[PDB]
């Protein structure tokens, strides 16, 4: 009932009769040779023209193809039948298993919960990782973000958090793959199936080889499944493989939609597009979503508008840095930028709070000394400034930890460290009861005991 | 070049001209409007920065023998948007819209030899089977083909020239 009238890249314009023009976000459909293509409506132009993004390869479109108007949004399989299966952005099954036996389908475009429906919790969630739940502890039903440049441990950290949190989590889990390597997705799927935990995980993949419309909307498909498990009243985990790719796929399309560029060439609507996703990934009085999001930062630039607007949407932010990864220290977390809403005396107790502020105070003071150390070296420092530098270097090394997913790399066995045990270790270093061990003793050890044992082995 | 902005005016004028049965009057009306646009003293005027309303009624005064209730209205709308130089292109697109609606096509026949009437006759039947439309054949004589006949239904071309068959052989080797 409509005809294609322009084709620019991934953007397709369609003409309809004046009485029949589609609503915004309705799904259209086209024969592209032997393929079926879905188009999602973005804008209504004058005169029955409607402008759309292709949810598939745009190659091989002529002008003048007949387009069929399906009078509803993109709607995806939802609920308990979606569990242990891999899906397209369009909710089609992508594993070689059969049809998804869904009882219900929901539209991927939804409003966020009302302010009256939100809920708050102080309940600490414990993790295996010394630096994370020392410096940036996070709570059941809250949001966590891992920020970093390329190749600094965003994925390895999220894969440890999957391991460690799934120890004490019983309910279902959702994983949205937005713009990350397919090989990872396949390794993860075989890890989940070979450990039989797959029966509780629902996976949505729109990986980086797919054209822009897939990468933009696949994030929303992942949320829509997690919002069902939440509205059933469960409590749920949502892991998002790289949320930056959603805003970048919006940038790749924006100029073709005829919009003047903003700032560093971004779409003018950047802050609304980010908010309208992030505000529906929340807990509520009926149930709770706990979520970890990876956030790539382009060119290591922590001040680019896309990272900068993402920082406001998160409860715990962990900031990785290349300079620490280059020193071998993993996980390459920066204690002077990583923070949490939950690091309060009332929430975590005074001893934890006081130990975390002690670690920050020492490590900041070590940064203040690096310029004089660079120009003049250490012998011109004050006699307790040498002591600060010796404690700060020991603290830097004791933040490092062996991970069970890094045995393929380190070969060293992995370690899990309880909260009580890590705060005791850092407090003891700051009081100086370990001020006679060498630095190398603190590298890659799970607990302080293991450092004194390693110092016995030199 | 006004090829893209002429479409709305061509379509709107053709629909109205269809409702009121005066298509054949609208075309002569548009042809006169196209011809006033080419005048030496008028094309200087159309480029000047006179106000649109003053410009419109000056053109309307010259455009005697136009359908004062409807033909003038279109010139007024176009001038109000300042697109009168699209009128010679609106004329061609008006002719095209008519040819579509009349289910009638024009196609061109080209050869080195002037065609004998039986050749032209069989072509006309063949094309009217290849198309829904009726065809008015145009004879063009160009020694380029050397031998054979070039069929040119606008964008669609069937080549039957020896030269074409030759320079298509040379690339196979």
């Amino acid at each position: 009932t409509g005809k294609i009238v322009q084709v620019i890249g991934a953007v397709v314009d369609v003409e309809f009769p004046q009485d029949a023009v589609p609503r915004v976000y309705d799904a259209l459909e086209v024969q592209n040779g032997n393929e079926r293509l879905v188009l999602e409506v973005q804008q209504q132009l004058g005169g029955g023209i409607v402008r759309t993004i292709a949810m598939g390869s745009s190659d091989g479109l002529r002008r003048g193809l007949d387009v069929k108007d399906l009078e509803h949004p993109i709607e995806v399989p939802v609920g308990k039948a979606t569990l242990g299966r891999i899906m397209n952005v369009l909710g089609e099954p992508v594993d070689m298993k059969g049809e998804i036996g869904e009882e219900e389908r929901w539209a991927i475009h939804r409003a966020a919960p009302s302010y009256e429906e939100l809920s708050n919790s102080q309940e600490l969630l414990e993790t295996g990782i010394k630096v994370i739940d020392l410096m940036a502890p996070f709570a059941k039903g809250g949001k966590v973000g891992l920020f970093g440049g390329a190749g600094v441990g965003k994925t390895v950290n999220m894969m440890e958090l999957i391991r460690n949190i799934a120890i004490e989590h019983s309910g279902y889990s959702v994983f949205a793959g937005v713009g990350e390597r397919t090989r990872e997705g396949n390794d993860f799927y075989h890890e989940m199936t070979d450990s039989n935990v797959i029966d509780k995980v629902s996976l949505v993949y729109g990986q980086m080889n797919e054209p822009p419309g897939n990468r933009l909307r696949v994030a929303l498909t992942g949320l829509t499944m997690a919002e069902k498990f939440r509205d059933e009243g469960r409590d749920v985990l949502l892991f998002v493989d790289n949320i930056y790719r959603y805003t970048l796929a919006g940038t790749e399309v924006s100029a073709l939609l005829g919009r003047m560029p903003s700032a560093v060439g971004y779409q003018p609507t950047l802050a609304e597009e980010m908010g309208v996703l992030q505000e529906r990934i929340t807990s509520t009085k009926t149930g709770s979503i706990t979520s970890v999001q990876a956030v790539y930062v382009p060119a290591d630039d922590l001040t680019d508008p896309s990272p900068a607007t993402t920082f406001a949407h998160l409860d715990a932010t962990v900031v990785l840095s290349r300079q620490i990864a280059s020193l071998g220290i993993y996980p390459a977390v920066d204690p002077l930028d990583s923070t949490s809403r939950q690091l309060d005396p009332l929430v975590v107790g005074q001893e934890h709070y006081d130990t975390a502020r002690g670690v920050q105070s020492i490590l900041q003071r070590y940064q203040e000394l690096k310029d004089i150390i660079a120009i003049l070296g250490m012998d011109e420092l004050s006699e307790e400034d040498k002591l600060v530098v010796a404690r700060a270097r020991k603290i830097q090394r004791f933040l490092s930890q062996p991970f069970f997913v890094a045995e393929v790399f380190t070969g060293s066995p992995g370690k899990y460290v309880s909260l009580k045990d890590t705060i005791r270790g850092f407090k003891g270093i700051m009081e100086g009861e370990y001020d006679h061990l060498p630095e190398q003793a603190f590298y890659m050890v799970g607990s302080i005991e293991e450092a004194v044992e390693k110092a016995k082995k030199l | 070049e006004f090829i893209t902005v002429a479409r709305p005016y061509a379509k709107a004028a053709f629909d109205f001209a269809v409702e009121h049965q005066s298509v054949e009057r609208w075309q002569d009306m548009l042809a006169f409007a196209a011809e006033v646009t080419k005048n030496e003293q008028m094309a200087e005027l159309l480029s000047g920065a006179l106000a649109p309303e003053t410009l419109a009624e000056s053109f309307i005064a010259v455009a005697g023998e136009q359908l004062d209730e409807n033909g003038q209205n279109l010139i007024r709308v176009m001038a109000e948007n300042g697109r009168l130089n699209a009128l010679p292109d609106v004329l061609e697109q008006f002719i095209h819209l008519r040819a579509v609606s009349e289910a009638t096509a024009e196609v061109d026949v080209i050869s080195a030899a002037a065609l004998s009437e039986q050749q032209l006759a069989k072509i006309s039947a063949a094309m009217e089977k290849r198309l829904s439309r009726k065809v008015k054949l145009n004879a063009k004589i160009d020694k380029s083909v050397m031998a054979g006949v070039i069929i040119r239904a606008g964008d669609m071309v069937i080549d039957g020239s020896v030269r074409g068959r030759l320079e298509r052989l040379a690339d196979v080797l």
């Binding site: - | 063949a126 050397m146 031998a147 006949v149 069929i151 039957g160 020896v162 040379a170 080797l173």
Partner: protein, 52 residues
């Protein structure tokens, strides 16, 4: 040293092959232009309109 000589055989073989092919069409051009100024055209166009 053998592979270097083998490439020269291929390059000579192609070099000559190219020349015979251009001379063939150059011959067919000259043959056709002189010999088709007849009702032979009528033969071609009748087949074309039968195919058309």
């Amino acid at each position: 040293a053998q592979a270097e000589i083998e490439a020269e055989r291929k390059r000579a073989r192609e070099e000559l092959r190219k020349q015979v092919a251009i001379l063939a069409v150059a011959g067919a051009e000259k043959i056709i232009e002189r010999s088709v100024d007849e009702a032979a055209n009528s033969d071609i166009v009748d087949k074309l309109v039968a195919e058309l």
